Amino acid sequence: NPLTHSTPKNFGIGQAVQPKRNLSRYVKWPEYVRVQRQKKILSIRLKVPPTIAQFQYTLDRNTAAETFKLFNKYRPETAAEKKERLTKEAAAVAEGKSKQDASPKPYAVKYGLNHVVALIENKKAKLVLIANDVDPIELVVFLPALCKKMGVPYAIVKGKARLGTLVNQKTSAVAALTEVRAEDEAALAKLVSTIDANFADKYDEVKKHWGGGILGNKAQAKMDKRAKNSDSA
């Protein structure tokens, strides 16, 4: 207390070598980082046509959680289950003379983007989820147009990873239900009614809009102070 002294260090330029601060904003990133950050900035600055930007309207977290808990019931067989039931029918079918229909009718989510697209065309899809993902965007951009054309409900949900876990893949890019059990028959239509509203019923009016055109916020702040302070002196 008597012996301890109070230094204070004076950062007033001109003196006191600066302290260590957080430079996280200023660092020079790798050139792969800096590409994928400006590949986002450049899709925001440009004017994105109406058939893009119909993505980025995506099912919000509430109906999202409600949506998967329906599909989560219907997940396809795993490898082991298939491995397991390939023993049963072997022992079941050959012995008891049965026709190898001995197993129940499976009800599972349909996946793959060549299969689902062919389901929609024969109108066998009761719902469809779509990932705002798929960097090769052209794969997925006509689906809202077929669904709305063929009178199939559809949705756009964030991520192909979550769409991938219920199919047991890494990534998926689509999902569908062509069949549903009577316990979930009523729980199905409560999702559709909320899903038809925000996607397939807004489809026509969304095709007017052009997204993007958002200025970065050092440009936005200089625009405003020119656009505001023109008027008010």
């Binding site: 260590k20 601060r21 957080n22 430079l23 996280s24 200023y26 660092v27 020079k28 990133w29 790798p30």
Partner: protein
């Protein structure tokens, strides 16, 4: 949620584990036997009048030693073959393309005594 704190603007490779080799097969499968050994280091003595005049005087053995041998391998294979102890080794490459060695045994020995033990004197 929040981000890191970097006190310096430089981003360098994160140091990631390096993994030692675990070869499936081996390389040459037979380790090569000792290439330069006791007997291949010193092939012959040197019998010329000038050579033999040091042996019988200055207690110095004079050998024709292989080209690949250095003063460490020589001092070691004189001790091993001929049993002696060595003060000093001096070497020169003769201008026929071979190397001569002047090996000076310690005062505990007489090179003349060992010189005639292997059959030259």
């Amino acid at each position: 949620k929040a981000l890191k704190v970097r006190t310096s603007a430089t981003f360098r490779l994160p140091k990631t584990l390096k993994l030692a080799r675990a070869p499936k097969y081996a390389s040459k499968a037979v380790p090569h036997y000792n290439r330069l050994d006791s007997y291949k280091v010193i092939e012959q003595p040197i019998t010329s009048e000038t050579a033999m005049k040091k042996v019988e005087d200055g207690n110095i053995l004079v050998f024709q030693v292989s080209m690949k041998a250095n003063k460490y391998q020589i001092k070691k294979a004189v001790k091993e073959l001929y049993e002696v102890d060595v003060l000093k080794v001096n070497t020169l490459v003769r201008p026929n393309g071979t190397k001569k060695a002047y090996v000076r045994l310690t005062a505990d020995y007489d090179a003349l005594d060992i010189a005639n033990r292997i059959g030259y004197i």
